[PDB]
């Protein structure tokens, strides 16, 4: 019989079924979100920027001067 | 910016007044440049102009030294010149928006260019440059030779062209026998200086026609005379000779079907206008098909071969009946593609048909009327498509030195009669059979066994 | 002591090549006074003159349009129905195509054998074809014999007779035709692309439909479809060549009377179940095929969208390239130059398809299994370059190419009639050449950038691929390539 | 200005020294053009005839062998040497002119240098 | 193309200056 | 240096999978698919640390 | 494909090795998070190196000054307690992550052929980590350190 993988090649259908066990599909008419995703990513991105600035400044200011020296500055 | 949504006319346009609804039927003006060149044109109502340059050269004029120059020249058509580079040429063609084409046949070959009627000086200047002043560079020629070798390597996919070439080579001796698709040895031997010498020897003024389709004659001649009037006047060396006596070509290939083709002489040629027209009508009567087309009525499904063979005999892949007419010679015959086991029966059927048309009374007046009407329709519906108009002008001027008016072809097709068909078939069948076979040929009959018929 | 260049075959070869190069070093002006490879605009208003396309509307709603040129000797007469495979009902998908095949055959008096005998006796041709949402039945005929063709068209479109034996024969023929289409890989690719892009919409389903549905016609579906969709307002009669508008109007009025009066209007029909683009991909890996054929596509513009002309220009400046193209490595479009120079593809073709209320726009490449990643990079790079950094010379060249292509394609009697019918169905009018040129000339670099930002910048894409495609980048790759982070 | 050995004693001495060096190693001045250097020389060498390019490779191999062996060409062939008999400058000029035209009006580079 | 290029370069310069201020908050330089 | 050699040898022979089976049928590029997974791991580790 | 003109920077020779081995390396599609643990061990090593360098900018290797120097780092250096706690607890997390790495390898039998060399180089790496952490723990010079 038809090997069932050339059946899909020879029979394109407008009703395509996906897995939908890990991700629920939007109904077809709804638009692509594309904005909620970027705003979530943006929140995380400036969290990351805060973290990187913190680490860099910690290292540089550690390599900076010291409290006992500042005390002995007179 | 705002736009009127394309179902409403766009703001303010200066759209011009229409044509007067049957303005006129333009005539062809032909001017003979004193060096011996032809410049012809006619007016067209559509905004497109087709301009071509046609030369009396090709495989017939090939020489054992060249033997492939025609095919290579078709491939090397609009390459770099002594005045523009290839990049500049392509950029110009793209800039005005036209199309370039090159055709190479056995007897004549042409270069055509298409664009709007505004760009006439550009068209004629670029064409004359690319023909008159070519710079056959070694690297460009080598690239085209590599491509031609690949195409020769991908030839068997179309057995019809292969069988036409085989029939010509087998059933002609020198001139028409010169091949058209440049065998591998010839391809290796071919070279840029060889192309230069061939062009300089053959592309001469007394064998050049510049034909325009939608161009005013005054403009065309005023832009073309300062580009062609200074060519040297040569004595137009004579055309090659070729005799028809020829037998069988047989080539074995894959196991899918066998392709057998038969052909004959009809030595009238294009100068014998009556016989050429009768041959065209006979072809439109014979014709046939591929038994796989699903277009619709009008494609010749009521032709004699179609009806009898295809509607009666199955397991026959395709069955056609064709012709090819050159100056002072012809070649008419039948192409058949069928199963390997059926091949002897297919040859018998084709011979039966070709003899059936010969014997009087076997062609009905109604079939002849249908053939004549279909031929007139084919010619008329072909003389649209201004490209075809310009090509017809060029070819006719190259052959006859003028343009034979369409009314002559129409009158000839009108006056053809059953006696003419029978007489021409009897004459064409007398000439020695030319046969070609390709594929599982190890079972097709012998050439002499087939030639036992027809005589 | 030093040898002359006569000896030393390499010295001889160097002398010959230097002689040739010094030969071609001096140009000539008389052959260069008109070239100008740099593109520029022009006003062809002095040239765009064509006979007026007279349009009449018979009160039953029937539009008849003619572009007469009575100096000719042929003509083309046809009917352009605003119906096709889009307007089915999910269980009668193949009805339009099968009805085409059947309506060729017979009527209450045509008798298919003698019908085709009549067509071929008068010398003409008769053809038809159905698109997703357009159907055409036209005939090419001669002067003083047009009326027979018009009568035959009216008879087959009104009083066709469907008989069961011919229906079985055409079922066999269409099953064969379905079995022969998978050889044509381009049509398979575009069918799959349509199905996966406009999925769960009437545009997704193919034209032929499923064989399981072709096996269950019974001619009741045929008659219902014809009576429900071949109504008077949705048809256009068109004529060109040697025709007379008054004669054509009179003949249409006298003949097309047993029509299907109804109310199913395509505008309201598309109002329900519209077309919705859904970004997705389908990739059919085989690895037994020498070449991999794929297509990426963005959502296009509708027929009446004013940006349709801009999309046409954009698909002109991503022009097609072929392995036997004359230009080769020198071409106007950057994508063709990239493909030809690095030889990363057998052939590429950019397509712009327009429907009602939607469309498509893509690049259709066909290559070898090992160059697919570089080819995909080239395609996406050039498209997003159209988004960001379009150039004036490229825009002008694209506009010139588009004008030339349209006016050269309109050539003959059948192309003119087809143009008349198609434009009357899509826009409700035939756009004159001068207005079309004005609309194209209204497109410049800013227009291209705005339209590309509207349609290409950071939009979902739909991909359909077939063959050895191990190296073809996944969906996320293309989706991220739809924008640039440098700008 | 354009200073040639006919109108300049210093240029005459410079040309004499270059001729002496190239004759010592027996290789023409054009052989010093590295294909990896410009990539225009690469194209110009791709366009030249095979006999000429093979002669160039042979002369370069001979020069490299002499350099390794720490010796010079024997005086016979040294007197038979013909430096400055060019074979490449015209083709290189043509290639550069074509590249300049293509760059000047639209156009993408036909070849490019990798990074690095 | 040059106006767009210089506009983009200026935008990237503004972004770079903002990143520099964020990394090194200098009211000492900001005030005068 | 030892870590670099470790990674080089692994990259020579691919990478195992939770099934232990041959895995050259369904393979995807490391970026971005496993960079994001590693990023989730890194952020969780950062919270722990 | 002849690379006449350059398409992508990632395929240029400057970023070609990095491209292959970081971006384009094919990976099994069903990996869980323990491969993430391997990458995490790499990150822990980098963190240890950086914090250790900045700590060694303040540590005196003398017996009379080591302990008070570390207390200097904790009390006087600007944000030095962060550096020291990061170094110490980062050694601890480095070992935690490497242990999870090793035990995933044991569970899924990743040591089997053809990854014998990978496992052996891992064992060498573990030896190096043990030695490094031990000699480092000697540095602060306390009771536990010395004894
Ligand atoms: C560095 C390598 C990349 C160099 C750039 C190459 C490039 O073109 O990149 C873009 C390029 C885009 O693809 P493409 O094919 O070149 O297409 C280009 C587009 O047509 C067009 O792309 P485009 O024009 O949109 O992008 C070009 C890109 C090119 O990048 C640049 O120009 C950056 C210039 C330097 C900026 C320095 C600041 O420019 C930018 O992204 C501009 C960004 C400007 C701001 C950057 C942030 C600044 C923060 C401070 O590649 C990527 O995006 C892929 C990056 C993959 C990174 C993988 C990292 C994996 C990490 C794994 C870690 C764990 C491993 C195991 C650890 C343990 C071991 C023991
Ligand atoms: C012992 C108690 C066991 C309780 C098990 C409960 C259960 O059903 O768990 C399986 C269930 C899903 O089962 P699964 O599909 O086999 O696992 C997910 C896959 O691994 C696929 O994971 P995914 O990528 O879809 O989800 C990403 C993310 C989702 O989680 C989140 O977004 C936040 C989780 C916060 C947890 C506190 O994380 C997870 O799902 C868990 C893995 C977290 C990364 C661990 C990497 C190693 C870190 C090493 C650090 C150094 C030591 O996961 C959960 O119930 C967790 C989510 C619960 C609701 C909160 C959602 C917040 C949004
Ligand atoms: C100002 C300098 C102008 C030089 C003009 C060209 C001189 C060319 C020439 O032949 O110079 C003589 C010499 C090198 O030539 P040569 O004698 O062949 O050396 C190797 C064998 N003795 O010596 C030189 O070329 C030395 C040049 C030194 C330039 C210094 C510029 C400051
Ligand atoms: C010291 C203080 C700091 C500030 C220093 C500022 C710079 C001073 C010196 C500037 C020198 C020029 C800089 C611009 C780069 C060269 C420009 C150029 O001509 O590049 C073109 C060349 C070939 O490219 P092409 O084939 O012409 O391009 C096709 C276009 N039709 O392109 C090539 O050949 C590509 C070359 C690739 C390698 C470039 C290396 C540049 C130097 C990198 C140093 C750091 C390396 C990284 C590691 C250390 C990081 C700290
Ligand atoms: C490693 C890091 C990346 C190094 C990149 C350079 C490598 C060496 C040169 C390579 C050749 C070259 O010119 O690359 C630049 C690239 C060219 O573009 P390409 O994709 O090759 O083709 C388009 C033709 N123009 O052009 C690009 O890819 C465009 C990149 C433009 C980036 C400009 C914006 C920079 C803004 C400042 C930094 C970010 C600001 C925010 C942070 C501030 C500091 C905290
Ligand atoms: C790279 C080197 C950066 C050096 C730098 O910016 O040092 C900081 C220095 C003092 O600035 P700060 O102490 O933060 O301000 C005093 C109260 N606002 O900053 C200054 O004195 C002025 C810094 C201006 C911006 C410099 C950007 C480089
Ligand atoms: C900062 C740390 C960067 C580490 C980068 C990765 C380690 C260095 C790899 C160097 C190497 O071996 O490069 C090979 C490449 C040779 O050129 P190619 O012919 O393209 O080789 C492809 C491999 N078959 O080599 C080259 O083309 C030259 C590469 C130079 C090194 C560039 C490293 C990135 C600099 C930013
Ligand atoms: C410095 C500490 C270490 C680092 C940075 C490190 C790094 C890595 C990396 C990057 C990988 C590839 C990604 C992955 O599969 O997780 C890997 C894989 C592996 N490592 Fe390590 N590793 C370390 C210690 C060890 C140790 C101590 C062993 C065991 C002796 C080990 C055994 C393995 C094995 C068997 C794999 C194969 C992964 C698989 O089968 O999928 N590693 N390591
Ligand atoms: C080259 C990089 C490194 C340098 C320069 C470095 C340097 C130092 C210095 C100066 C100390 C003493 C400071 C203190 O007492 O807190 C220290 C402590 C230590 N280091 Fe490192 N180190 C490095 C990498 C590592 C690594 C990779 C490990 C392994 C995990 C490690 C493990 C330790 C431990 C366990 C201590 C003692 C923690 C404590 O102070 O209680 N170090 N290191
Ligand atoms: Zn069909």
Residue numbers in the entry:
A (entry chain Q): 75 to 148
B (entry chain N): 50 to 504
C (entry chain M): 41 to 527
D (entry chain F): 7 to 122
E (entry chain W): 15 to 46
F (entry chain O): 198 to 246
G (entry chain O): 2 to 148
Study text:
Complex III (CIII2), also called the cytochrome bc1 complex or ubiquinol-cytochrome c oxidoreductase, is an obligate dimer that transfers electrons from ubiquinol in the IMM (reduced by CI, CII, or alternative NADH dehydrogenases) to soluble cytochrome c in the intermembrane space (IMS).
The MPP domain, composed of two MPP-α/β heterodimers (one per CIII protomer), extends into the matrix. Consistent with their known flexibility and conformational heterogeneity, the linker and head domains of UCR1 (Rieske iron-sulfur subunit) were disordered in our reconstruction and an atomic model was not produced for this region of UCR1. All heme groups (heme bH, bL and heme c1) were clearly visible and modelled into each cyt b and cyt c1 subunit of the dimer. A catalytic Zn2+ ion was also visible and modelled into each MPP-β subunit. Density consistent with cardiolipin, phosphatidylethanolamine and phosphatidylcholine lipids was found and modelled into the VrCIII2 map.
